[PDB]
């Protein structure tokens, strides 16, 4: 039960790999569950849920 974005940019391997990317790298020791059929990512424990939205916004993936 973490967090959850769903992204509209999210339509293939190449967006959700990109994500999970951004997550990890900036922040360390984060789950990254994503799913590009489903264009949406389930996210662990995180920083706050404004700041991963906007990690995942900056993998040049979001809903905005």
């Known amino acids: 039960a973490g967090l959850s974005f769903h992204v ?3 339509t293939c391997g190449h ?3 990109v994500i999970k990317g951004a997550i990890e790298k ?6 990254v569950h994503a ?4 264009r949406t990512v389930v ?3 995180v920083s706050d849920a404004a ?8 993998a040049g993936y979001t809903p905005e």
């Open 35 to 38: 799913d590009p059929a489903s």
């Open 8 to 10: 509209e940019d999210m």
């Open 43 to 45: 996210v662990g424990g």
């Open 15 to 17: 967006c959700a790999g």
């Open 51 to 58: 700041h991963i939205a906007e990690i995942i916004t900056a």
């Open 26 to 31: 900036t922040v360390p020791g984060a789950a």
